[PDB]
Amino acid sequence: SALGKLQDVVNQNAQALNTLVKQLSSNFGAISSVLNDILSRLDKVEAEVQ
Amino acid sequence: VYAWNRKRISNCVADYSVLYNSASFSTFKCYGVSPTKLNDLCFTNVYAD
Amino acid sequence: SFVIRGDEVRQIAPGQTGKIADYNYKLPDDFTGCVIAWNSNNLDSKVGGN
Question: Which intervals of the chain form a coiled coil (chain A)?
Fold first, then answer.
């Protein structure tokens, strides 16, 4: 545990990138989080809203 | 309509353009997919009620 | 300006498909304008057919 100040800096930056990547799996109210679902399921005017 | 009949559709190739351009239909609507795009998709199953 | 059957008036809109929108008259997805239509069964129909 002696170098905890330096490990805390490594841990916070890994936690922040892991959070930023997992937010790509969110819908935010769209029909899917997968952008290729929206583009393969819907036509232009309906897709642009999602 | 109180006893609605379900047909499972499987093991086959469709053509939904032949359906949505058919002269037979007085109304046609879709949800979660757009009718123009259906011929590019696949499904684990389809059901007709 | 043109004549179509009453079913087909829905196809005279931006982003549509079907034999009129596909093979006869296509509007662009960013159309700016007005679509105006009226029944002409008093002029464009005939007994035995026009």
Answer: 7-50
